Amino acid sequence: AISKNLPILKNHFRKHWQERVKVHFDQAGKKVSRRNARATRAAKIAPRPLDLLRPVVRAPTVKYNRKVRAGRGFTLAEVKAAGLTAAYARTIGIAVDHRRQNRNQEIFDANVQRLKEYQSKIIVFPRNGKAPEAEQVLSAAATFPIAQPATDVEARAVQDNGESAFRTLRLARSEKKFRGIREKRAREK
Amino acid sequence: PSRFTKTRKHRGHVSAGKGRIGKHRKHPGGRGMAGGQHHHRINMDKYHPGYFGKVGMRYFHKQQAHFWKPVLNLDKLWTLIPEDKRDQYLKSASKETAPVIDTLAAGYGKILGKGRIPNVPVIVKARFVSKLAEEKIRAAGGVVELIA
RNA sequence: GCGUUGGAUUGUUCACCCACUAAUAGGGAACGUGAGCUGGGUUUAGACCGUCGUGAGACAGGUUAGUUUUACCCUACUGAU
RNA sequence: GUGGCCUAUCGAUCCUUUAGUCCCUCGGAAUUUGAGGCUAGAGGUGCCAGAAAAGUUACCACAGGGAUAACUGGCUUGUG
RNA sequence: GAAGACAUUGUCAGGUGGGGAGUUUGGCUGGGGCGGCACAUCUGUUAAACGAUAACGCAGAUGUCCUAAGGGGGGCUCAUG
RNA sequence: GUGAUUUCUGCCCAGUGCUCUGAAUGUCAAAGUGAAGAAAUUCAACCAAGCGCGGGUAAACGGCGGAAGGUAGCCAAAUGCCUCGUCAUCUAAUUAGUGACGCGCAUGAAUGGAUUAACGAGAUUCCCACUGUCCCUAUCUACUAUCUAGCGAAACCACAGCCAAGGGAACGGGCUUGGCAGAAUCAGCGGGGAAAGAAGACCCUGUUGAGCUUGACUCUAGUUUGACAUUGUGAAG
RNA sequence: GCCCUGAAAAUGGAUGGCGCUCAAGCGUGUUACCUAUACUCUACCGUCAGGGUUGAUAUGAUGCCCUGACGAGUAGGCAGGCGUGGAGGUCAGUGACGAAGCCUAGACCGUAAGGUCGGGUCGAACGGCCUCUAGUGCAGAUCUUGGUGGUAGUAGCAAAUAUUCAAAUGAGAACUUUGAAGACUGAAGUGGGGAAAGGUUCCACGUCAACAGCAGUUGGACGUGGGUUAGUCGAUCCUAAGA
RNA sequence: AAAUAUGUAAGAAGUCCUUGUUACUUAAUUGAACGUGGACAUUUGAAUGAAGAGCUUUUAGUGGGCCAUUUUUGGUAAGCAGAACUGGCGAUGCGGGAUGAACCGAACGUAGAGUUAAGGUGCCGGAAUACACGCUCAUCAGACACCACAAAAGGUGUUAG
RNA sequence: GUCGAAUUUGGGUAUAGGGGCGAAAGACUAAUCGAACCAUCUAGUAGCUGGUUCCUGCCGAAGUUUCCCUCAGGAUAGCAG
RNA sequence: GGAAUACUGCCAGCUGGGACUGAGGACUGCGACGUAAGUCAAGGAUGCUGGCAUAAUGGUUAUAUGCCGCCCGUCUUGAAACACGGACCAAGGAGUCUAACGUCUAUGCGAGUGUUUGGGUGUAAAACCCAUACGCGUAAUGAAAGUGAACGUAGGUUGGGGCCUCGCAAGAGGUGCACAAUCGACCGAUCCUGAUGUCUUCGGAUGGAUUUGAGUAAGAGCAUAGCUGUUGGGACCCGAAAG
RNA sequence: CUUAGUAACGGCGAGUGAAGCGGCAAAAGCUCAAAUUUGAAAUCUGGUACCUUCGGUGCCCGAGUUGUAAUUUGGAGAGGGCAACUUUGGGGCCGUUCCUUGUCUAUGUUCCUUGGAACAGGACGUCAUAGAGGGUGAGAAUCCCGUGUGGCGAGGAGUGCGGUUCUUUGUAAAGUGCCUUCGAAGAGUCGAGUUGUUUGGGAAUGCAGCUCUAAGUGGGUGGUAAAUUCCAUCUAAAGCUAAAUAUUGGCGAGAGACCGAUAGCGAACAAGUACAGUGAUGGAAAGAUGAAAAGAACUUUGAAAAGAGAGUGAAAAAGUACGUGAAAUUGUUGAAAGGGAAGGGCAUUUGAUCAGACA
Ligand SMILES: [Cl-]
Ligand SMILES: [Cl-]
Ligand SMILES: [Cl-]
Ligand SMILES: [Cl-]
Ligand SMILES: [Cl-]
Ligand SMILES: [Cl-]
Ligand SMILES: [Cl-]
Ligand SMILES: [Cl-]
Ligand SMILES: [Cl-]
Ligand SMILES: [Cl-]
Ligand SMILES: [Mg+2]
Ligand SMILES: [Mg+2]
Ligand SMILES: [Mg+2]
Ligand SMILES: [Mg+2]
Ligand SMILES: [Mg+2]
Ligand SMILES: [Mg+2]
Ligand SMILES: [Mg+2]
Ligand SMILES: [Mg+2]
Ligand SMILES: [Mg+2]
Ligand SMILES: [Mg+2]
Ligand SMILES: [Mg+2]
Ligand SMILES: [Mg+2]
Ligand SMILES: [Mg+2]
Ligand SMILES: [Mg+2]
Ligand SMILES: [Mg+2]
Ligand SMILES: [Mg+2]
Ligand SMILES: [Mg+2]
Ligand SMILES: [Mg+2]
Ligand SMILES: [Mg+2]
Ligand SMILES: [Mg+2]
Ligand SMILES: [Mg+2]
Ligand SMILES: [Mg+2]
Ligand SMILES: [Mg+2]
Ligand SMILES: [Mg+2]
Ligand SMILES: [Mg+2]
Ligand SMILES: [Mg+2]
Ligand SMILES: [Mg+2]
Ligand SMILES: [Mg+2]
Ligand SMILES: [Mg+2]
Ligand SMILES: [Mg+2]
Ligand SMILES: [Mg+2]
Ligand SMILES: [Mg+2]
Ligand SMILES: [Mg+2]
Ligand SMILES: [Mg+2]
Ligand SMILES: [Mg+2]
Ligand SMILES: [Mg+2]
Ligand SMILES: [Mg+2]
Ligand SMILES: [Mg+2]
Ligand SMILES: [Mg+2]
Ligand SMILES: [Mg+2]
Ligand SMILES: [Mg+2]
Ligand SMILES: [Mg+2]
Ligand SMILES: [Mg+2]
Ligand SMILES: [Mg+2]
Ligand SMILES: [Mg+2]
Ligand SMILES: [Mg+2]
Ligand SMILES: [Mg+2]
Ligand SMILES: [Mg+2]
Ligand SMILES: [Mg+2]
Ligand SMILES: [Mg+2]
Ligand SMILES: [Mg+2]
Ligand SMILES: [Mg+2]
Ligand SMILES: [Mg+2]
Ligand SMILES: [Mg+2]
Ligand SMILES: [Mg+2]
Ligand SMILES: [Mg+2]
Ligand SMILES: [Mg+2]
Ligand SMILES: [Mg+2]
Ligand SMILES: [Mg+2]
Ligand SMILES: [Mg+2]
Ligand SMILES: [Mg+2]
Ligand SMILES: [Mg+2]
Ligand SMILES: [Mg+2]
Ligand SMILES: [Mg+2]
Ligand SMILES: [Mg+2]
Ligand SMILES: [Mg+2]
Ligand SMILES: [Mg+2]
Ligand SMILES: [Mg+2]
Ligand SMILES: [Mg+2]
Ligand SMILES: [Mg+2]
Ligand SMILES: [Mg+2]
Ligand SMILES: [Mg+2]
Ligand SMILES: [Mg+2]
Ligand SMILES: [Mg+2]
Ligand SMILES: [Mg+2]
Ligand SMILES: [Mg+2]
Ligand SMILES: [Mg+2]
Ligand SMILES: [Mg+2]
Ligand SMILES: [Mg+2]
Ligand SMILES: [Mg+2]
Ligand SMILES: [Mg+2]
Ligand SMILES: [Mg+2]
Ligand SMILES: [Mg+2]
Ligand SMILES: [Mg+2]
Ligand SMILES: [Mg+2]
Ligand SMILES: [Mg+2]
Ligand SMILES: [Mg+2]
Ligand SMILES: [Mg+2]
Ligand SMILES: [Mg+2]
Ligand SMILES: [Mg+2]
């Protein structure tokens, strides 16, 4: 059962696995179904763009916080700063998320600009029903794409103050490690 | 394909290559990793030393994202600059025209110093740096800026 | 070459006596011979006793009851065309 | 002179426990208990490369074995 | 009529429990069993003058003992007649 | 549990069980209570039943020697190894039978001992009558077998079917060397075909089972004991 | 030294047999002769190794050619090939003027797996080559299903006392019908009715391929029809163990 | 104190002359180790041979053996049990031993010719009823290794000493 | 053997698989009993027995070492392609 | 005293009879005989002649004769076995597919590589096109906190194919990739040394150590496919007593 | 898709094993309880009459204050005060979107040969947004049905919406600024101990039994038990909700490098049928005459079944035991051999039989 110089393998097939095998024979069929469903939904919703406008947010975690992506919806504060109510925003094609909060001025200002540009690029048909026939744009994300914010200029002058970056990192670790013991010794005295 | 397998060659040879004496039985020696300490010990002590036992200390609810820190050496530092712009910066090695390299935007966490860089000033922004890497960058006239 | 027996007890081979007789010599043939017989013994399952075992049970110890199948083929043999 | 003049006198993983280092971790941040790691020993497997283990079957079962006993035959002839 | 905050019932805890359940009940071996250990080791011999070398071969031994019976130095010489 | 009647059922409570209005300061769960600590926690005291200790119990399990040492009886008995025991009787001759004898391998008292008229498709020995069981075979009847007309299977089958010796997987129809050997056949016959009927029920092996037993290992229904809940009201020591 | 005594086993018997005596026996010496898939030389097949040759105007430089050596084989490994169902491409492939399949002690090619042709039978599809793919090759498994032998015109068709003569019918009578005779069951029957169970087996006409282990004109067979009549006999009602 | 087996050496990674390094070593430039430079070529350091030598990865089957000569243990012995070296069978036909897994000879592509091995040449049966010197007469002669058995003790049988 | 009774027997009814029933043989429970029958889990597992399908060419073994509840099996080294 | 003969050996002395073989396919080579031309037995057979032209040779098949040949498959040290399966014939009948992997090989690209989750598109399960991520690789080492790979032509020495210089050649010198051995240097772990400076306990510079790592030292990997091997799966096919 | 065979669990053995982030498909939000309408229960089932009938109106009982409507669900929100503008609701009809259906919409059967049959071969044409497929006496684009491209109808569903038309809903409703006072938010429940089970969850992941049982700047969580001090993050013990996902059943369709009557479902057939079992259950075998029955009139032999002729057909070498018709096994005829098997190998004789070249 164990022979030769081979890696240790862990193949989890000791249950009735053959009863739960899923082969995606309908991969091509489902692609046709999704394309048909998108086409019939676009014809149903008039010239509406088939998707709602989304804000730009910072991804969490230290690993992914260097990038911005699309969030669920604009906050109540962002909607209010744009000059309209949340209820009217939902009926006009804007996603609203009540549980997200604003703590960064850069993110808040950018989402305010997105709402203002969106309002100036759409036409809202009156409730009377005359309904002038306008061409349908199938995507709002492509019309309003998300770009990573600029960080630094291409070239700049060298400014060295004589300090050491390695020394700065080492001292930062040391201060955090011994903060508790230093306070106790100071308090006991 | 079946037509190239040795099963086709074994047609008409009785034992199908498994021998007359030993034969091909179901599971002589057990199934899987059975008998790793009793009758398969020699094959485990060699080719797999360290298999049995425990060493370190446990860590409940590990999150690999906390330990994300890809490393980049100095010998590949200039590859982060587009090729069309590398040549002009190399030939124009001077202050107040030093290129800025943001290694975090390239997906790197710590800068290590292994190779040798050209004697050209460069502004390197990184989260972490080794002691040797900073010295070589400063020796060429550049600086390291810590970011978060 | 030719003969080498009749009986009491025992499942007995063996053994031991009675008697007759010229004589009651020893052996082999898959320890000749069970589709030839017989089935008393051994050696399935029931049951009893003694000793042993806490017990289920054991005993090359004793005791009693316990299904013996098929030839029309080939050859051999005996006779017959 | 790194135990007994020499050739034998002995023991893994897991777990427990002790000594050392007073060092590393408890992952939102700290102090103190507690717990978990690092290095070196001890508690033992004598079936001694180390499963935790009482019988009976004459009511019996299965896979096999002439690799193996209870008849002849063959070799041997101590014994007769 | 009796009985009474006790019985009863519910949940944990200790005992009892082959009535019942599940499982186990080494190996080597001139068959197996009983015995023995040739199962981890040591000395001499079998062993055929390098080394290696079998049998339930032959004659024995080991699971200890010692603050000295360990280490160094000095002086001395034993059995027996 | 023993197993009609008659007669009689001895001694042993140390062991294993069963049982007790017996004793107390042994062992002892959870809850509760106390101390220590900042707490987790730790330690200590108290402490139910059972166990332990003490008594009873053999027509309970069982024992009866060189806790008590087999009493009354009975026996080479369905129980005695040695053993075909010894003596007597029965026969011409008896490993049989019967009557006695008993240091009885290993008889024995309701795990019942001994004795018993009647009864028994039970197990044994002898005698009379009787007979083909035998000396020692012979003969008769019916139906088969046999032959014909019609009807018409099965077992089994590597290929097949004459011997002697040899060697060989140590017992050949075939191989080697010899003997020999002539179509097609019928009724019989049980020497051989290590004939046929079944993957040996005996024996061993397998890290294959099952039935049954027991202070084997690990558990469990039930039952018992304590705590808490159900669970309130009044008084006293 | 040779010979002899010592020297006894079971079916008949083996210097291999016959047979052999100045041997065809024993000891020893000298020559001739016989024959293995061994040795020597030659041809051919294959394998391995070392080499030669791109220069057009003729086809395979995985081609052609030169030189030397070698060849046993279970378990097992590797290499080059043969055959089968289906798929892409190609041969503007074969075919009702006969495709496939089958039969053929007829012919040819290959060491072989196999391939090709003629003759007969037959009636509607099928093949070569380059590649792809697999539910791809049978003598065995007390293999599965189906079919068929030897045995073999053989074992056998022998319990329950027993049949016989004549006529009628019919292609056909030991077995059907009628008559006559001889027998048996012997009233706890081989008689006369029923309960369960069966389900049309009851009755008539027609009728014999199969069934009645011989026969058959007969039948509980086959075909076509007919037949079971209740206020009083039962069910229905009652309660039993119980459900 | 053998025989048979058994370790090492027989050159270039060698020998020689001079002198550089070090924290080791010496009373000490004493030594040790490692080097710079110079001198000595393949009768370059015995024999014979060498379908080339060196090296790596991967994986099948097998892990019941048995026999013969010699050495050898237990056992009265065994076609018994157990070891040592080598050769065989197993896995292998072919000629010989009548016959036989292991003995003798010899190992195999398809054929032709020649010559042999072991074993044979009265007949079966291919080949001298050849040659030569002796021995033996059996009322149970004898006849070819492994191998299919015979002893102690005897004979004025006959032969030689 | 027994034959007027612990007799024989029809129909109705009750007891169902670790259960029933047993004047007790491990007997009987639909030809099935020391634990019935039917379907499924289930193609249950097997170090054990049997079988395992075309040709030619080249090379070509092992029954030995160490460890294993190892002794009819594996791992490991060797031999082979 | 002089010969002969026997025995053994040698001759690049001569010559007769018999058998088997004829491979190759212009020339080329080495020799012989010749003043010459030429010839020849000199790197493999030609010349002459007869009969028959078909079943005559030959093939196939049946039979006869000589010698030889035991029944296949299977387990086994050993099978023709008195060991097991097999009366006969037809058809069916057993190493498969999948997930994850080792070695090797082919292909694309290469410090990178992978279009097919999904989107676009379409002659519609095909083909064609594409963003962002993610996987693996490009850094290791510690239990962990953590730290993190150049003294030097990315080192020295020995052996190295190829190339360069000189040389007729033989050789000598120079340069030396891959690879092999060895001594160093660098990174992490462990054990020591503890500078400038201090939240007076922080900080850890510098220099060491018969210690240790699946490391560095001018990258090799990623993807697809194939044979072979591994593990889990019914797992090459058929088979238990049980639960 | 990935994280990942990873953290972790495990006689730490055999084995087991998630989650956050990141890319993508699909996207959608919400409402009760807890407040006095209190200058007016403003709410609702049912009955009855009528009507524009998936309902409406009037009237009358009843339910209900032990709470039915309006108003407010934590993102908030409510009671007062001030100043401002912004926006409508409910039905007919005609079309569109979708589904279920019907109908219409090209081109040779022209010559020759073979054949029973032309749908074969050969010659000469036509159509093609139709050369998919099937049928018709053999391989048919053009003989028939269809196929391709379009036109013209018939009957419904859903109000998704493209136009027209009838009703003013309403001193109605909703949104937005500022000041002030407030801001009710779910109990045998959270949580805790213990027991059992379960999980990767480890001083205990979820679930359940028993015991104990909260708080309101509170409560839960922050993957190592505890005390103390902070921080972060949500708001339990009440409720509704499309799409992306699943589908060996049902109904309607389209396909395959799948099987081809011992295969493929057990079943291509009067198949879950015949048949077996008391019962639960078990469970087969079985497809092919020919284009067309044209299925053999009539004669003759026989009691009859049938036979022999005749006849039908392209073929009775297709006769309802029917396409093709292999092997085992069997009959007849012909040839050969045979003294207790047969069969085989090498070589040649004899008999039979046969190809090749006559250059
Ligand atoms: Cl191969
Ligand atoms: Cl016992
Ligand atoms: Cl006769
Ligand atoms: Cl061929
Ligand atoms: Cl039941
Ligand atoms: Cl012959
Ligand atoms: Cl570390
Ligand atoms: Cl726990
Ligand atoms: Cl169906
Ligand atoms: Cl049934
Ligand atoms: Mg082979
Ligand atoms: Mg096999
Ligand atoms: Mg094996
Ligand atoms: Mg297998
Ligand atoms: Mg062990
Ligand atoms: Mg006998
Ligand atoms: Mg008999
Ligand atoms: Mg007999
Ligand atoms: Mg017999
Ligand atoms: Mg008897
Ligand atoms: Mg008995
Ligand atoms: Mg001493
Ligand atoms: Mg935490
Ligand atoms: Mg051991
Ligand atoms: Mg143990
Ligand atoms: Mg044996
Ligand atoms: Mg004697
Ligand atoms: Mg309770
Ligand atoms: Mg039990
Ligand atoms: Mg044993
Ligand atoms: Mg030695
Ligand atoms: Mg009495
Ligand atoms: Mg007595
Ligand atoms: Mg007596
Ligand atoms: Mg008594
Ligand atoms: Mg014989
Ligand atoms: Mg013999
Ligand atoms: Mg025989
Ligand atoms: Mg013979
Ligand atoms: Mg003969
Ligand atoms: Mg007879
Ligand atoms: Mg016989
Ligand atoms: Mg057997
Ligand atoms: Mg059996
Ligand atoms: Mg074992
Ligand atoms: Mg068991
Ligand atoms: Mg002679
Ligand atoms: Mg030869
Ligand atoms: Mg050879
Ligand atoms: Mg070969
Ligand atoms: Mg044809
Ligand atoms: Mg034939
Ligand atoms: Mg046809
Ligand atoms: Mg197959
Ligand atoms: Mg077959
Ligand atoms: Mg075979
Ligand atoms: Mg068979
Ligand atoms: Mg008869
Ligand atoms: Mg007869
Ligand atoms: Mg009879
Ligand atoms: Mg009669
Ligand atoms: Mg009578
Ligand atoms: Mg009468
Ligand atoms: Mg009738
Ligand atoms: Mg009849
Ligand atoms: Mg008849
Ligand atoms: Mg009828
Ligand atoms: Mg084996
Ligand atoms: Mg032996
Ligand atoms: Mg073998
Ligand atoms: Mg011989
Ligand atoms: Mg001759
Ligand atoms: Mg009765
Ligand atoms: Mg019994
Ligand atoms: Mg299987
Ligand atoms: Mg099975
Ligand atoms: Mg070879
Ligand atoms: Mg075996
Ligand atoms: Mg001829
Ligand atoms: Mg012959
Ligand atoms: Mg002959
Ligand atoms: Mg012969
Ligand atoms: Mg054997
Ligand atoms: Mg054999
Ligand atoms: Mg067998
Ligand atoms: Mg058989
Ligand atoms: Mg077949
Ligand atoms: Mg097959
Ligand atoms: Mg495969
Ligand atoms: Mg079990
Ligand atoms: Mg699980
Ligand atoms: Mg559960
Ligand atoms: Mg844990
Ligand atoms: Mg924990
Ligand atoms: Mg819901
Ligand atoms: Mg079928
Ligand atoms: Mg037809
Ligand atoms: Mg025809
Ligand atoms: Mg036909
Ligand atoms: Mg035939």
Tab-separated table of N, CA and C (backbone and C1' of nucleotides) in Angstrom, chain F residues 3-8 72-75 77 79 104 107-110 112-116:
chain	number	residue	atom	x	y	z
F	3	G	P	-34.373	-38.541	41.668
F	3	G	O5'	-35.921	-38.880	41.847
F	3	G	C5'	-36.394	-39.634	42.962
F	3	G	C4'	-37.900	-39.584	43.070
F	3	G	C3'	-38.651	-40.625	42.242
F	3	G	O3'	-39.874	-40.955	42.900
F	3	G	C1'	-39.271	-38.468	41.527
F	4	A	P	-39.991	-42.268	43.820
F	4	A	O5'	-41.516	-42.702	43.668
F	4	A	C5'	-42.547	-41.730	43.602
F	4	A	C4'	-43.907	-42.345	43.816
F	4	A	C3'	-44.141	-42.997	45.170
F	4	A	O3'	-44.455	-42.070	46.193
F	4	A	C1'	-44.861	-44.461	43.475
F	5	U	P	-43.769	-42.206	47.640
F	5	U	O5'	-44.237	-43.638	48.160
F	5	U	C5'	-45.609	-43.912	48.400
F	5	U	C4'	-45.845	-45.371	48.700
F	5	U	C3'	-45.081	-45.948	49.880
F	5	U	O3'	-45.668	-45.628	51.127
F	5	U	C1'	-44.934	-47.430	48.048
F	6	U	P	-44.756	-45.148	52.359
F	6	U	O5'	-43.883	-46.430	52.718
F	6	U	C5'	-44.496	-47.649	53.111
F	6	U	C4'	-43.472	-48.740	53.285
F	6	U	C3'	-42.264	-48.380	54.136
F	6	U	O3'	-42.521	-48.491	55.525
F	6	U	C1'	-41.542	-49.430	52.144
F	7	U	P	-42.104	-47.305	56.526
F	7	U	O5'	-40.519	-47.417	56.615
F	7	U	C5'	-39.900	-48.587	57.125
F	7	U	C4'	-38.420	-48.595	56.837
F	7	U	C3'	-37.670	-47.321	57.182
F	7	U	O3'	-37.368	-47.190	58.561
F	7	U	C1'	-37.057	-48.009	55.017
F	8	C	P	-37.404	-45.736	59.248
F	8	C	O5'	-36.103	-45.011	58.680
F	8	C	C5'	-34.815	-45.548	58.933
F	8	C	C4'	-33.772	-45.008	57.985
F	8	C	C3'	-33.484	-43.520	58.056
F	8	C	O3'	-32.672	-43.169	59.162
F	8	C	C1'	-33.600	-44.209	55.792
F	72	A	P	-21.118	-47.385	59.339
F	72	A	O5'	-22.674	-47.375	59.000
F	72	A	C5'	-23.644	-47.279	60.031
F	72	A	C4'	-25.039	-47.221	59.466
F	72	A	C3'	-25.380	-48.296	58.446
F	72	A	O3'	-25.760	-49.518	59.055
F	72	A	C1'	-26.072	-46.178	57.639
F	73	G	P	-25.360	-50.920	58.383
F	73	G	O5'	-26.310	-51.013	57.110
F	73	G	C5'	-25.815	-51.459	55.859
F	73	G	C4'	-26.424	-50.676	54.726
F	73	G	C3'	-26.060	-51.136	53.324
F	73	G	O3'	-26.834	-52.244	52.896
F	73	G	C1'	-25.821	-48.792	53.466
F	74	C	P	-26.120	-53.598	52.407
F	74	C	O5'	-25.580	-53.245	50.952
F	74	C	C5'	-26.468	-52.827	49.925
F	74	C	C4'	-25.723	-52.175	48.787
F	74	C	C3'	-24.543	-52.955	48.231
F	74	C	O3'	-24.927	-53.977	47.329
F	74	C	C1'	-23.900	-50.711	48.583
F	75	C	P	-24.019	-55.293	47.167
F	75	C	O5'	-22.875	-54.848	46.153
F	75	C	C5'	-23.201	-54.266	44.900
F	75	C	C4'	-21.978	-53.737	44.197
F	75	C	C3'	-20.829	-54.716	44.021
F	75	C	O3'	-21.037	-55.607	42.937
F	75	C	C1'	-19.993	-52.637	44.783
F	77	A	P	-18.585	-55.726	37.206
F	77	A	O5'	-19.634	-55.044	38.194
F	77	A	C5'	-20.845	-55.701	38.542
F	77	A	C4'	-21.931	-54.718	38.908
F	77	A	C3'	-22.274	-53.675	37.854
F	77	A	O3'	-23.194	-54.175	36.897
F	77	A	C1'	-22.094	-52.656	40.005
F	79	U	P	-20.081	-49.397	34.557
F	79	U	O5'	-19.435	-47.942	34.637
F	79	U	C5'	-20.104	-46.883	35.311
F	79	U	C4'	-19.190	-46.145	36.260
F	79	U	C3'	-18.034	-46.965	36.829
F	79	U	O3'	-16.927	-46.102	37.092
F	79	U	C1'	-19.455	-46.281	38.590
F	104	G	P	-7.854	-49.980	46.932
F	104	G	O5'	-9.178	-49.434	46.236
F	104	G	C5'	-10.413	-50.129	46.364
F	104	G	C4'	-11.519	-49.465	45.581
F	104	G	C3'	-11.433	-47.943	45.501
F	104	G	O3'	-12.031	-47.493	44.282
F	104	G	C1'	-13.414	-48.557	46.623
F	107	U	P	-14.987	-44.062	44.497
F	107	U	O5'	-16.242	-44.805	43.860
F	107	U	C5'	-17.368	-44.075	43.399
F	107	U	C4'	-18.656	-44.734	43.818
F	107	U	C3'	-19.573	-43.891	44.690
F	107	U	O3'	-20.378	-43.005	43.930
F	107	U	C1'	-19.343	-46.053	45.633
F	108	G	P	-20.720	-41.536	44.482
F	108	G	O5'	-21.496	-41.806	45.846
F	108	G	C5'	-22.826	-42.302	45.842
F	108	G	C4'	-23.361	-42.460	47.241
F	108	G	C3'	-23.140	-41.284	48.178
F	108	G	O3'	-24.053	-40.223	47.976
F	108	G	C1'	-22.553	-43.274	49.286
F	109	A	P	-23.646	-38.731	48.404
F	109	A	O5'	-23.982	-38.670	49.958
F	109	A	C5'	-25.163	-38.040	50.425
F	109	A	C4'	-26.373	-38.917	50.226
F	109	A	C3'	-27.656	-38.434	50.884
F	109	A	O3'	-28.330	-37.475	50.090
F	109	A	C1'	-27.340	-40.745	51.327
F	110	A	P	-29.293	-36.375	50.754
F	110	A	O5'	-30.434	-36.178	49.665
F	110	A	C5'	-30.902	-34.884	49.313
F	110	A	C4'	-31.668	-34.915	48.015
F	110	A	C3'	-32.436	-33.641	47.686
F	110	A	O3'	-32.453	-33.453	46.273
F	110	A	C1'	-33.949	-35.452	47.886
F	112	G	P	-29.580	-36.535	41.816
F	112	G	O5'	-30.336	-36.837	43.185
F	112	G	C5'	-30.656	-38.165	43.568
F	112	G	C4'	-30.067	-38.503	44.913
F	112	G	C3'	-30.094	-39.969	45.308
F	112	G	O3'	-29.054	-40.722	44.710
F	112	G	C1'	-30.831	-38.653	47.124
F	113	G	P	-29.211	-42.309	44.534
F	113	G	O5'	-28.863	-42.898	45.973
F	113	G	C5'	-27.534	-42.887	46.472
F	113	G	C4'	-27.406	-43.733	47.712
F	113	G	C3'	-27.998	-45.131	47.628
F	113	G	O3'	-27.156	-46.062	46.969
F	113	G	C1'	-28.717	-44.108	49.622
F	114	A	P	-27.792	-47.177	46.002
F	114	A	O5'	-28.509	-48.191	46.998
F	114	A	C5'	-27.763	-48.907	47.970
F	114	A	C4'	-28.654	-49.542	49.009
F	114	A	C3'	-29.728	-50.487	48.497
F	114	A	O3'	-29.241	-51.771	48.149
F	114	A	C1'	-30.676	-49.033	50.082
F	115	U	P	-29.875	-52.559	46.899
F	115	U	O5'	-31.365	-52.890	47.359
F	115	U	C5'	-31.608	-53.780	48.439
F	115	U	C4'	-33.030	-53.703	48.942
F	115	U	C3'	-34.110	-54.256	48.027
F	115	U	O3'	-34.181	-55.672	48.065
F	115	U	C1'	-34.825	-52.202	48.974
F	116	U	P	-34.888	-56.484	46.874
F	116	U	O5'	-36.444	-56.253	47.126
F	116	U	C5'	-37.394	-56.482	46.099
F	116	U	C4'	-38.636	-55.651	46.301
F	116	U	C3'	-39.515	-55.472	45.074
F	116	U	O3'	-40.386	-56.569	44.854
F	116	U	C1'	-39.159	-53.372	46.101
